[PDB]
Amino acid sequence: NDPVTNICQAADKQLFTLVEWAKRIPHFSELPLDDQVILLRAGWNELLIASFSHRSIAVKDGILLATGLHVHRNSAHSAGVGAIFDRVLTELVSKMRDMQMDKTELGCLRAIVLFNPDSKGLSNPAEVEALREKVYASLEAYCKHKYPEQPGRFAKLLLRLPALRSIGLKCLEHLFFFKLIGDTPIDTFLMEMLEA
Amino acid sequence: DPVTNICQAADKQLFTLVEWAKRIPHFSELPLDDQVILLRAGWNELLIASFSHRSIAVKDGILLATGLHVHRNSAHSAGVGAIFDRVLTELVSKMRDMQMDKTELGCLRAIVLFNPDSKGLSNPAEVEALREKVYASLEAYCKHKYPEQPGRFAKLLLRLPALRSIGLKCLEHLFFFKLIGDTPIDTFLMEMLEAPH
Amino acid sequence: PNDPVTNICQAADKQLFTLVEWAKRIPHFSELPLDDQVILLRAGWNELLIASFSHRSIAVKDGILLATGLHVHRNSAHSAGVGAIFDRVLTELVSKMRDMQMDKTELGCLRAIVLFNPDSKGLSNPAEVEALREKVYASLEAYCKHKYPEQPGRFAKLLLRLPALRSIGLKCLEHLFFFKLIGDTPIDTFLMEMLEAP
Amino acid sequence: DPVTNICQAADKQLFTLVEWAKRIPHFSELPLDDQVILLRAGWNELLIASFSHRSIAVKDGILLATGLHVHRNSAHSAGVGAIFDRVLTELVSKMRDMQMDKTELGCLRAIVLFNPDSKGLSNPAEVEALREKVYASLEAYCKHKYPEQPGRFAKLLLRLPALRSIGLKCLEHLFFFKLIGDTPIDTFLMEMLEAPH
Ligand SMILES: CC1=C(CCc2nnn[nH]2)c2ccccc2/C1=C\c1ccc(C(C)C)cc1
Ligand SMILES: CC1=C(CCc2nnn[nH]2)c2ccccc2/C1=C\c1ccc(C(C)C)cc1
Incomplete structure (x- = not known):
């Protein structure tokens, strides 16, 4: 009923999925807890993008979110994020499709991204x-x-990875994920209040 | 928990804003999709205008609606100090010195609300x-x-031009996240990390 | 010729000077401390320029007329990668100036208000401005x-x-709008001639 | 003139960049429109990669092509201290410690140049x-x-991902302008003010 809160809940669930994933990566949990927080904050964007891009391999012109949401180009453009959507399709999804990147390869790529030695504040980057x-x-x-x-x-x-990095930056900049899962719930909420 | 409070408080602020808009003369005479466009285009400046005017009682700080006080120290620490000081010197102090009253504030906000430049409006001329x-x-x-x-x-x-540029800068630099959303995300993450696996 | 950036700089140079000459003619501006004059010009130059060419472009449909005589169309603006900002200029400024038939006296006053910007950081005496x-x-x-x-x-x-001028000014500075417009073609030309050259 | 210096310097860099690209095997066989596209898409990262590797023999500073030595002091002064430190920590110091040589640098820059993601490429697959x-x-x-x-x-x-985000951050913050163009513009403007009448 309360759109921002529902959006945050969805964000909450997504972020926890990632945390559980990282804990299953050998040696991640042996790193200091601060360093674990630093790696997840630095990496969550690219990680989520990498994940949903691979999932979207089988589908036409769209992005499959982990939330079940099937986002089409029209929706993405409606939400004001059509350019970034396009880049995800062109630089990530289609290339993943074309080379048939498998799940083992995606996992390794995500683990590479996770263990990012450039993350600021790392007590021991060489270890990472x-x-x-x-x-x-x-x-x-x-x-x-x-x-x-x-x-x-x-x-x-x-x-x-350079593509993933730049798209990750643009997604962070324009609140890509949040705009996508939130755009229609906000319109819907607003409309209900405006009519009442 | 911290993050939850923020989301709820945002939802409350969104609620109050829509209720304010509906009492603005003729706003509800606009097509409903246009009203929606206007609210989504205006929320940021509308909010900044309110907390700025509310903050005239305070020196070098800002009052967000839930009695939450933020000092410029915290802004500077978070890396959004220049932007915070623009709010202070271009909005707050100016409102304070001319003693902008609440009717004048309500009008400026209504003008901000009735933005004929907003993309997608079916009739900008009516706006x-x-x-x-x-x-x-x-x-x-x-x-x-x-x-x-x-x-x-x-x-x-x-x-209004100051409001416009400050509005853009705030979003561009994730002003709100860096001020009130940063620490809660750290806490949130630590809890997740400590949770049973 | 063979030095594209130099040529872009000369054009920008000539344009900024037109702005500076205009400002010195504004009563009292030259009575401000020199460092304030420089602060005001740096803070305002982009908006002042955008306001000038927007008003000049009432004379055309769907383009920007620059002070040099260059008529920029939508296709050029798209190639230059600034089609979106270009469309804002036409929609929020040019066409709105045209709708009200903003005259040259009003343009001059609006630009002078922009010049005398008391929010400009570092002014010796902002209340004077x-x-x-x-x-x-x-x-x-x-x-x-x-x-x-x-x-x-x-x-x-x-x-x-003025608020639209403000936002568009920020976007133009951010994407180097003016420089891409007057610079896109000469750069492609210089590159092309060089790549074909032995 | 200081500004005129900067422009002439950039024209030089552009010229050297183009002559470098032509000596990259198979580059000139691409359509000429595609060569222009790649050079335009790549110039910023290509430049950053070069001055970074050039700065390995330099302590707590950055060396721009004309012996133009830039220290942290100037960078912090210009409000770009953060990006400066990224160039040092993520590029310069990593190049130094693994002893990246000029052949490796050359290969990486060529990989950058052959960017198949560039918009408008007539044949991405070829690139x-x-x-x-x-x-x-x-x-x-x-x-x-x-x-x-x-x-x-x-x-x-x-x-390369670090080089990519560094390239984006430099543009977004006007990194080069703030470091080498800022003071010359003040000089330029003062000269304009000293002109007659
Ligand atoms: C837009 C926004 C983001 C999205 C990111 C952002 N964009 N611009 N600034 N931050 C964010 C993130 C975390 C926390 C808040 C926020 C926020 C706005 C906000 C929320 C609550 C309040 C009051 C009720 C306390 C005031 C403003
Ligand atoms: C891109 C750019 C701007 C446009 C604005 C900008 N964008 N990103 N940083 N600055 C600018 C403006 C003034 C001066 C330089 C620059 C500049 C790049 C540049 C020019 C010359 C050299 C020489 C030393 C070889 C090196 C880099």
Whole structure:
């Protein structure tokens, strides 16, 4: 009934999904708790974007949110975030589709993103760089075994990260996720009050 | 818990705003989708205008509606100090020095509300006509309430560009998040991390 | 020729000077301390420029007429990547100036109000600048009421284009609007000639 | 003139950038419209990558092409202390510590240049294919230069997200203007004021 509160609840649930995921990554929970907070704050955007972009591989012209919401271009443009939507489709989803990025590869990429040594305030960044290195070593080993005819695949996966970074910035800037899940609930709320 | 309080308080502020808009003469005569466009386009400036005027009783700080006081120290610490000082020096102090009264504030807000430039309006001309009715009322008010201050009406209108730019800066730099949403997110996260897995 | 940025700078240089020459003609402006004059010009230059070319562009439909003679159309503005800001200028300023037939006296007054901006950071004496601003808008009001007595709402309507000018000014500075407009083509040209060149 | 200095310096950098691109294998075989697009999409990151690597021999400062040495003092003074520190911590110091050499730098810049995401590219796939050739070559080089660092190749590619956000932040904050254009403009304006009448 109360739109902002419902939106926050949805944000709450989403963020907790991410926290549980990170705790299942080997060695994340062994890091200091402050450093864990720092990594999740620094990374939550790209992590969520990476996640919903891969999920949207099977669908036409849209984004599947973890909330179940199926966002089309029209809706995204209605919410004032059509440009960013387009970029997600073009630079992430379609490229994920085209190379058939699998779930193991996505997880490794998200774990790389999570273990971001550049995150400000890290008591021990070198330690975080070292976890990231273990992760990418494993991803490379995986790609070579699973896709031997594709020697450049590991690098191709790594090279989606600059795109993810810039889209992540734009999403943070324009409150992408919040505008999408909130736009219609706000219109609906407003309309009900305005008619009463 | 901190985050929950913020969301509820936002929901309350949104409620009060819509109720205020409905009592504005002729607002409800507009097509409902236009009323919605206007409220969504105006909420930020409308809010900044209110808390600025409410803050004239305070030195170098701001009063958000729930008796929540924020000092410029906290703004500067959070990295939004320059913006906070623009609120203080371009809105608050100016409102204080001219003794902007509550009728003049209500009019400025109604003018902000009736924004004919808002994208998607089915009829911007009707919105411009409602805006002109409001500023005609305001000019009538100022002339008769303050007949010894001939430039007062204009002075009030000339606080609107400051409101516009401060409004943009606030959103651009996540002013509100950095002031009142930052720490609660840290707390929120720590709790999640400590939760049973 | 062969130095695209230099040429862009010369054009901007010439444009800013037109603004500075206009300001020195505004009564009392040159009586302010020099450092205040510089503060006012830096704070106001973008809005002053936008206001000038917007008003100049009433003479055309769907374009911006620059002081040099360059007529910028929508296609150029789109190529330049600033189509959105371009459309705001046309919609919020040009067409609204046209709708009310804002005249050159009113344009001059509105720009002088913009120049005498008492919120400009660092002014030695902000009240002195507010005092000059107040003189200007009293003159503008008496002018509108004398020239257009049948439009009692005109003065206020003029002032009420200022918030739009403010937001568009911020967007223009942010995306280097003016510089992309006068600079997009010469850059492509310089690049192209170089890439074709042996 | 100081401003005239800056413009001429930028024209120089542009010229050198273009001549560099032409010497990148297969670059000139792309459509000319596509070459222009890539150079325009890439110039900012390409410049930042170069002055960052150039600054490794410099203590607590940044070196711009004309021996223009910029220290933290100036950066903090200009309100861009934060971005300055990012360039040092995320680019300059990481380049230094892993001893990124000019061949690796060259490969990374070429990867940047061959950006298949650039808007308006007539054939994105063609650009992506050139990127892959460049990165295969960079991997081959890392393998023999440091066979005992199997993670060097990936480590190099993983500075590119930092370069991307740094590039965006520099533009958003007018980083270069605030550092080298700010005072010259004051001088320029004062000269304009000294002109007759
Ligand atoms: C728009 C907004 C964001 C979204 C991000 C943002 N955009 N601009 N500033 N912050 C945010 C995030 C956290 C906390 C608040 C906020 C906020 C606005 C707000 C909420 C509550 C109050 C009162 C009732 C206390 C006042 C303003
Ligand atoms: C992009 C840019 C602006 C436009 C505004 C801007 N955007 N991002 N930063 N500044 C500007 C303005 C004034 C002076 C420089 C600049 C500048 C970049 C620049 C120019 C010359 C050099 C030389 C040293 C090779 C280096 C960088």
